[PDB]
């Protein structure tokens, strides 16, 4: 391994070009983003054989300073004329390789810094404010891009992936976990009706990298739509395990978005411990936080 870069490059852009005309799906109202506020956290990694002596000899002649990579990213957010993080990453990568011929490979991660609308009273009625936004610490879109310079000096995207991170969903009933191995190590009771609490990170790849950019919004798959599919499928399914749930979410995603090649899931189980089983005159129960250990699952569904 030999690479170096800059992490936690925050950049907030006001009035990016709006994303509009995204083909809708029945699980989600999403059709686009106004982009009054567009926040992203970028990580940049660059490699190349010509970086060797920066390590072996302490020679900085071909070191682009990591601080300069941060300026590069923030200046390029100001000049980006597109409408998605995925497209922003391509713009940065192509511009960076064009600028710095001694770099053979660039890898970029962009994470949305999300904001939500708020209520303001305008002319006697509540409406979404065009000025005041709430910083959200819940789920967020992500994007990843790797680009290389070939021997013939052409540039090529070697990997692209979009995602949704930080989704935390609890379904209060309609979930079982039964029928698992019972042996000397098993103490977990079977549960016919648990309040399944799952953390979800979902990532997708497109058949055609072009479609990730949003230049034609009809082919763009938004993280918002993925979120809404996940909640709808969770609601619809009498789940039999997290494994069973995530497979079904992936199938739905790939049915709705035929331009996608695959969907990958990283899920964790955070289901609460039950404290009170029966409350007189109620269907209610009481639960509490479990001990730290958490189950997890990782799975790819392909088209």
């Amino acid at each position: 391994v030999m690479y170096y870069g800059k992490g936690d490059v925050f950049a907030y852009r006001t009035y990016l070009k709006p994303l509009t005309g995204v083909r809708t799906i029945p699980e989600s109202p999403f059709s686009g983003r106004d982009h009054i506020l567009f926040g992203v956290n970028v990580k940049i990694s660059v490699g190349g054989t010509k970086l060797l002596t920066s390590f072996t000899k302490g020679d900085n002649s071909l070191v682009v300073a990591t601080d300069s990579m941060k300026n590069f990213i923030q200046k390029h957010l100001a000049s980006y004329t597109g409408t998605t993080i995925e497209g922003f990453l391509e713009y940065v990568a192509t511009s960076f390789l064009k600028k710095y011929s001694h770099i053979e490979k660039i890898s970029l991660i962009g994470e949305e810094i999300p904001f939500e609308t708020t209520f303001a009273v305008k002319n006697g009625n509540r409406a979404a404010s065009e000025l005041v936004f709430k910083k959200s610490r819940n789920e967020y879109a992500t994007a990843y891009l790797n680009m290389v310079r070939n021997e013939d000096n052409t540039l090529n995207i070697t990997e692209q992936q979009s995602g949704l991170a930080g989704l935390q969903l609890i379904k209060v009933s309609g979930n079982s976990f039964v029928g698992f191995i019972r042996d000397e190590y098993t103490t977990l009771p079977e549960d016919s009706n648990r309040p399944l609490f799952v953390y979800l990170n979902i990532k997708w790849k497109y058949k055609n990298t072009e479609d990730s950019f949003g230049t034609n919004p009809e082919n763009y798959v938004a993280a918002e739509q993925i979120r809404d599919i996940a909640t709808s499928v969770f609601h619809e399914t009498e789940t039999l395990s997290i494994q069973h749930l995530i497979y079904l979410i992936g199938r739905r995603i790939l049915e709705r978005f035929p331009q996608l090649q695959e969907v990958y899931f990283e899920s964790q189980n955070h289901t609460w411990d039950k404290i009170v089983e029966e409350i007189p005159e109620s269907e209610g129960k009481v639960y509490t936080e479990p001990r730290p250990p958490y189950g997890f699952q990782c799975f790819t569904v392909t088209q």
Copy 2:
């Protein structure tokens, strides 16, 4: 000082009695809570002169185990027939003092663990799910209660306060900070149009402690309504400082809720640093995260 207790007592109740009929205000749509899921994190502190020898002699005869205080709280969430955290705290406190006559004082903090609705497709259209909820890491309601046992054996609430915590609001324009002291220590440039980013913790006290419980919802002041007032006032105001903004929010709150005695604010400034001042063919700018130091303000408005 002499007290002891239990912190991080999480308790999640399904199907609490709904809060309904809360008097609405024009800044907020809020009228109540369905309470399909009711999550709270409680902290309990108890004191009393009879606890001395637990410290000075290691005598545990009059020590209610902190673990037992946790069972007490979680069992009482199962039996609570009310509709608010404030009322839940009163129920716990009155029951605890009634049970344990050697305790002279109880102090309780309850923090909402908030959940948001999600979309599910039912009968061909998206609707809010009654089953699947999103755990939110954004703003949340809070409540605080202190209760004592008097010499004549009556119980009395000595302090009550409700609040909203973790609100993070950014207004992209319509904010100035000018006219402050310029001397040998001043390097901050005056800014006629900054994207003010404020964190807000707002706390209120009622003229009549009865009104905090929600038993008569007409007199209950919900944290949701406070949030919506704060966003509306922020939108409406060409702010001149955070100080100026929070005073105006407090005035509005006290105008809308005449049953309130006071509102207290803890605000912090997290405004981003500007990177790109002018973008050709756009009203947009680029910003980034500042260095760690943050300004803060603390202020009470009274009725």
Copy 3:
């Protein structure tokens, strides 16, 4: 309430005047501080009735920008000629009130950012490095100071407190918790031998605030020495509860430092849960992390 200020003012100073000339105690080999590297995180709060219209009218005429407060603190660390955080706070507080005649009250907190010694081979042997330090995320010293301006423009310290924060100690045997109340809320078993894990925050006040500054260092009480008393007493004591332990720690502190007036403790119980009790041919056991709820105690011992 009315005040404002700046939080997370980090400041790192090299080659502060060393602390030497301290008075030793049996429980601690502490003999001073080299101060090659001196890091502090400072919070400053200021108030005064002349600040009202900064809130009520948006008038910034008498507002010292919080950014300027940060500059003030950082510049004063560069000129500070003393040897303790407590002295640094006094230097800042007196300087700030002399500069700003309309401020009536200043409150400061300083928290040490601790570093540990590392070792290097040079000149034929391994020895403590004068250049390379390890940043520590464990316990650290604290200081608190409040100063006011009187009507005659004299300045008075109105409260001072020193402390030790973030100490996490586990004693593997020699601790009991038995004899507590057993009623309908009690499910905790009696334990004649538990591996008590406590978090300790210890704060002390001096009879004469001058002794806190280090100008006559033989009268200074160092956080390092408090730490060493705490670990020694924990070892020496067959503990009957955390309450029992902290009283005995406080007694020893007050015996060793007759110039202190009191010592205040905030303790938390983080004891692990037992998994395996009997290991063949071993005195070992296996434990794991508990659920989140934690007991706590708050207790003052006075001289």
Copy 4:
């Protein structure tokens, strides 16, 4: 991709067999581990093609509950008779594959939960306590192991890696960063003397995986010794960049441990920003925390 498992399996063991018989190096006085207290946080991942229908059909017949994986790990810490985390992972992995014939692959990570010695006065003198330990939040050792079942039911280790995580080192002088690219993206000044602050994650692989287990301890490479090389080389080197430094650290590690095949570094730059350059009658300066963006480097040195 298809696998599932359990994360944050904390396990604390008292009186593990001590590690002794280690081979020393000039840079480190490390001579073994007492193992009065041995804490580990374990992540386990399992896969196998027979797990498919647990995802595609909700069939839990071949699902080992993740809760049971936690039990397995904790119980195996109680029976483990070795002396290293690396050996513990091998014990767990071999045991798990022998138990569960339908699992084809297991991946494990163990992270040390470190404790530090404390001292107490007893029997007339101050000495290291055999009972009281300080939980440390600084650097810690790590281990990684992957094991597979072949068609003939033999088991093979397919990858092993050891490491040191969380090391944070600041060198106050004797570091330069000069000579880097100066173009339209460069605003960073050349610095002939900076207080370089690096975070280091160092990982090593052995030529023969058996040497990782500690069974013949003279061939074991301890994280403590790696830590001490890192601090010594940092002190000894007039650094020209972090890249320069980590190559020299890796060279020294490979020279001191000829049984290693390679050493991999993940470094981060957290160097503070300068505030005050010239202090009267002192060699000191004042620095503060930077904005969030951090440079990083990833680099392998091979034997």
